[PDB]
Amino acid sequence: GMSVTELTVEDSGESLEDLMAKMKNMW
Amino acid sequence: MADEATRRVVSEIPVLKTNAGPRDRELWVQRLKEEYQSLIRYVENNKNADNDWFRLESNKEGTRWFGKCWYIHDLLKYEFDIEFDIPITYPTTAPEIAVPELDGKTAKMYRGGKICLTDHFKPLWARNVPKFGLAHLMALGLGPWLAVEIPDLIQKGVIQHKEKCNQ
Protein backbone atom coordinates (compact mmCIF):
# COMPACT_ATOMS: atom_id res chain seq x y z
CA GLY A 1 0.00 0.00 0.00
CA MET A 2 1.74 3.15 -1.25
CA SER A 3 1.96 6.27 0.93
CA VAL A 4 3.22 8.85 -1.57
CA THR A 5 1.63 11.82 0.26
CA GLU A 6 3.14 10.84 3.66
CA LEU A 7 6.63 12.19 4.56
CA THR A 8 9.67 9.84 4.13
CA VAL A 9 13.27 9.80 5.52
CA GLU A 10 16.11 11.55 3.59
CA ASP A 11 17.48 8.13 2.54
CA SER A 12 19.78 8.86 -0.42
CA GLY A 13 22.31 6.01 0.06
CA GLU A 14 24.15 7.71 2.97
CA SER A 15 26.35 5.57 5.29
CA LEU A 16 25.75 5.15 9.05
CA GLU A 17 29.17 6.52 10.05
CA ASP A 18 28.56 9.68 8.01
CA LEU A 19 25.01 10.03 9.42
CA MET A 20 26.12 9.87 13.07
CA ALA A 21 29.23 12.00 12.26
CA LYS A 22 27.20 14.95 10.90
CA MET A 23 24.73 14.42 13.77
CA LYS A 24 27.22 14.71 16.70
CA ASN A 25 29.18 17.42 14.84
CA MET A 26 26.04 19.61 14.39
CA TRP A 27 25.74 20.28 18.16
CA MET B 1 -4.25 22.39 21.83
CA ALA B 2 -2.63 18.95 22.48
CA ASP B 3 -3.83 16.68 19.64
CA GLU B 4 -2.94 19.42 17.09
CA ALA B 5 0.62 19.85 18.46
CA THR B 6 0.99 16.06 18.18
CA ARG B 7 -0.33 16.02 14.58
CA ARG B 8 1.94 18.94 13.50
CA VAL B 9 5.02 17.32 14.94
CA VAL B 10 4.39 14.07 13.01
CA SER B 11 3.41 16.21 9.95
CA GLU B 12 6.94 17.80 10.01
CA ILE B 13 9.05 14.74 11.11
CA PRO B 14 9.81 12.42 8.12
CA VAL B 15 8.61 8.82 8.56
CA LEU B 16 10.79 5.71 8.71
CA LYS B 17 10.06 2.11 7.52
CA THR B 18 12.42 -0.34 9.34
CA ASN B 19 11.66 -1.33 13.00
CA ALA B 20 14.60 -3.69 13.73
CA GLY B 21 16.55 -4.15 16.99
CA PRO B 22 20.30 -3.88 17.84
CA ARG B 23 20.48 -7.70 18.19
CA ASP B 24 21.29 -7.98 14.45
CA ARG B 25 24.38 -5.99 13.40
CA GLU B 26 23.21 -5.38 9.80
CA LEU B 27 19.47 -4.93 10.51
CA TRP B 28 20.51 -2.39 13.15
CA VAL B 29 22.67 -0.42 10.65
CA GLN B 30 19.58 -0.17 8.38
CA ARG B 31 17.10 0.83 11.14
CA LEU B 32 19.64 3.19 12.79
CA LYS B 33 20.33 4.79 9.41
CA GLU B 34 16.69 5.72 8.82
CA GLU B 35 16.44 7.00 12.40
CA TYR B 36 19.49 9.22 11.99
CA GLN B 37 18.24 10.63 8.65
CA SER B 38 14.80 11.41 10.14
CA LEU B 39 16.23 12.93 13.35
CA ILE B 40 19.01 14.91 11.51
CA ARG B 41 16.33 16.32 9.12
CA TYR B 42 14.18 17.26 12.14
CA VAL B 43 16.99 18.97 14.13
CA GLU B 44 18.44 20.62 10.96
CA ASN B 45 14.99 22.21 10.32
CA ASN B 46 14.29 22.94 13.98
CA LYS B 47 17.72 24.48 14.78
CA ASN B 48 17.82 26.39 11.43
CA ALA B 49 14.44 27.95 12.35
CA ASP B 50 16.17 29.19 15.57
CA ASN B 51 13.71 26.95 17.49
CA ASP B 52 16.31 24.62 19.09
CA TRP B 53 15.31 23.17 22.49
CA PHE B 54 17.25 19.83 22.49
CA ARG B 55 20.56 18.36 21.15
CA LEU B 56 21.03 14.55 20.82
CA GLU B 57 24.12 12.47 19.77
CA SER B 58 24.96 8.71 20.10
CA ASN B 59 27.90 6.24 20.11
CA LYS B 60 29.15 4.58 16.88
CA GLU B 61 27.12 1.49 17.98
CA GLY B 62 23.89 3.54 18.44
CA THR B 63 23.15 1.56 21.65
CA ARG B 64 23.39 4.52 24.05
CA TRP B 65 22.09 7.98 23.29
CA PHE B 66 22.94 11.19 25.16
CA GLY B 67 22.23 14.89 24.77
CA LYS B 68 21.13 18.08 26.50
CA CYS B 69 18.16 20.47 26.32
CA TRP B 70 17.66 24.16 27.17
CA TYR B 71 14.43 26.03 27.85
CA ILE B 72 13.65 29.75 28.12
CA HIS B 73 10.90 31.42 30.15
CA ASP B 74 10.41 34.73 32.05
CA LEU B 75 13.60 35.98 30.30
CA LEU B 76 15.60 33.22 32.11
CA LYS B 77 17.57 30.31 30.60
CA TYR B 78 17.92 26.74 31.93
CA GLU B 79 19.79 23.57 30.85
CA PHE B 80 19.25 19.82 31.41
CA ASP B 81 21.23 16.65 30.48
CA ILE B 82 19.80 13.35 29.10
CA GLU B 83 21.22 9.82 28.62
CA PHE B 84 19.40 6.55 27.74
CA ASP B 85 20.12 3.09 26.21
CA ILE B 86 17.93 1.12 23.76
CA PRO B 87 16.61 -2.30 24.90
CA ILE B 88 17.89 -5.26 22.86
CA THR B 89 14.29 -6.37 22.18
CA TYR B 90 13.06 -2.81 21.22
CA PRO B 91 9.38 -3.59 22.09
CA THR B 92 6.18 -1.78 20.96
CA THR B 93 6.30 0.03 24.34
CA ALA B 94 8.49 3.15 23.94
CA PRO B 95 12.03 3.42 25.48
CA GLU B 96 12.69 5.36 28.76
CA ILE B 97 14.78 8.58 29.03
CA ALA B 98 16.70 9.55 32.22
CA VAL B 99 17.74 13.10 33.23
CA PRO B 100 20.65 13.22 35.76
CA GLU B 101 20.19 17.03 36.11
CA LEU B 102 16.72 16.40 37.65
CA ASP B 103 17.60 13.06 39.35
CA GLY B 104 16.31 13.95 42.85
CA LYS B 105 14.31 17.11 41.89
CA THR B 106 11.41 15.17 40.33
CA ALA B 107 10.01 12.45 42.64
CA LYS B 108 10.99 8.80 42.08
CA MET B 109 8.19 7.78 39.67
CA TYR B 110 7.00 4.15 39.23
CA ARG B 111 9.55 1.57 37.95
CA GLY B 112 9.17 2.19 34.23
CA GLY B 113 8.96 5.83 33.08
CA LYS B 114 10.86 8.05 35.57
CA ILE B 115 10.43 11.13 33.23
CA CYS B 116 8.46 9.44 30.40
CA LEU B 117 5.13 11.27 30.84
CA THR B 118 2.29 8.81 30.10
CA ASP B 119 -0.80 11.14 30.21
CA HIS B 120 -1.27 11.36 26.42
CA PHE B 121 2.10 9.98 25.21
CA LYS B 122 1.50 6.34 26.30
CA PRO B 123 -1.96 5.99 24.63
CA LEU B 124 -0.67 8.00 21.59
CA TRP B 125 2.37 5.73 21.12
CA ALA B 126 0.49 2.48 21.83
CA ARG B 127 -2.33 3.40 19.37
CA ASN B 128 0.21 4.51 16.72
CA VAL B 129 3.71 2.99 16.62
CA PRO B 130 3.92 2.05 12.89
CA LYS B 131 7.49 3.30 12.24
CA PHE B 132 7.83 5.85 15.11
CA GLY B 133 11.46 6.20 16.28
CA LEU B 134 13.52 8.40 18.64
CA ALA B 135 12.71 11.66 16.72
CA HIS B 136 8.98 11.04 17.31
CA LEU B 137 9.67 9.92 20.94
CA MET B 138 11.49 13.12 21.89
CA ALA B 139 9.15 15.50 20.04
CA LEU B 140 5.98 13.83 21.49
CA GLY B 141 7.40 12.83 24.91
CA LEU B 142 10.48 14.82 25.99
CA GLY B 143 9.14 18.02 24.31
CA PRO B 144 5.68 18.10 26.00
CA TRP B 145 7.19 16.85 29.33
CA LEU B 146 9.58 19.85 29.41
CA ALA B 147 6.80 22.23 28.23
CA VAL B 148 4.58 20.94 31.11
CA GLU B 149 7.28 20.74 33.81
CA ILE B 150 9.04 24.12 33.19
CA PRO B 151 5.97 26.26 34.12
CA ASP B 152 4.84 23.93 36.92
CA LEU B 153 8.30 23.37 38.51
CA ILE B 154 8.96 27.13 38.35
CA GLN B 155 5.62 28.09 40.03
CA LYS B 156 6.02 25.19 42.53
CA GLY B 157 9.64 26.16 43.33
CA VAL B 158 12.00 23.33 42.24
CA ILE B 159 13.99 24.83 39.31
CA GLN B 160 15.81 28.20 39.07
CA HIS B 161 18.04 29.82 36.38
CA LYS B 162 21.83 29.38 36.24
CA GLU B 163 23.08 32.77 34.82
CA LYS B 164 23.43 33.99 38.45
CA CYS B 165 25.66 30.97 39.28
CA ASN B 166 28.30 32.41 36.88
CA GLN B 167 28.05 35.72 34.92
Side-chain angles (χ1 to χ4, degrees):
Chain A
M2 277 179 170
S3 296
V4 77
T5 46
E6 187 65 283
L7 304 112
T8 274
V9 276
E10 279 310 306
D11 171 28
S12 298
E14 300 286 67
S15 295
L16 213 302
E17 291 183 87
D18 275 321
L19 288 179
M20 76 206 342
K22 57 157 159 274
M23 179 62 118
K24 62 209 274 195
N25 289 10
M26 86 210 292
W27 193 88
Chain B
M1 298 191 165
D3 293 45
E4 57 181 272
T6 301
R7 101 175 194 61
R8 159 265 209 86
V9 164
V10 66
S11 189
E12 82 175 291
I13 294 179
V15 325
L16 301 72
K17 296 92 182 71
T18 328
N19 232 238
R23 278 165 65 89
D24 230 303
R25 314 180 78 186
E26 54 111 352
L27 298 178
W28 191 234
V29 173
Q30 169 49 43
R31 165 54 163 78
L32 191 56
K33 153 154 146 284
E34 308 206 309
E35 248 209 25
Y36 269 116
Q37 294 185 285
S38 34
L39 211 184
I40 293 163
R41 209 294 177 69
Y42 176 53
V43 290
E44 278 175 323
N45 153 76
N46 181 53
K47 291 173 168 266
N48 271 218
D50 190 10
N51 259 248
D52 99 88
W53 71 271
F54 83 117
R55 178 196 80 159
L56 197 83
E57 62 186 284
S58 12
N59 303 279
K60 314 298 287 295
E61 306 180 3
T63 41
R64 159 164 64 129
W65 303 64
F66 21 54
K68 297 192 191 290
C69 24
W70 305 250
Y71 205 104
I72 315 291
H73 175 58
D74 228 60
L75 299 304
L76 309 180
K77 184 148 197 177
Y78 339 97
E79 177 249 285
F80 316 95
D81 182 84
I82 45 175
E83 183 205 71
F84 65 109
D85 157 86
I86 303 309
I88 55 175
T89 50
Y90 215 166
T92 320
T93 303
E96 178 173 350
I97 302 174
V99 179
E101 182 65 43
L102 297 184
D103 180 55
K105 268 189 176 149
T106 187
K108 286 207 174 185
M109 243 54 180
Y110 164 73
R111 200 84 191 203
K114 69 180 60 56
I115 69 114
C116 185
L117 86 173
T118 43
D119 290 55
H120 98 95
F121 171 78
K122 236 283 276 167
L124 178 284
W125 187 283
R127 76 181 285 221
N128 103 109
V129 49
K131 51 243 145 67
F132 266 22
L134 302 183
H136 301 74
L137 166 79
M138 236 146 287
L140 304 174
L142 192 79
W145 161 75
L146 252 151
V148 160
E149 263 46 84
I150 289 286
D152 191 52
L153 295 178
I154 284 173
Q155 70 183 2
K156 284 291 113 186
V158 202
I159 292 173
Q160 291 298 307
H161 87 128
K162 202 161 190 178
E163 280 60 66
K164 208 182 293 165
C165 181
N166 185 239
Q167 301 292 111

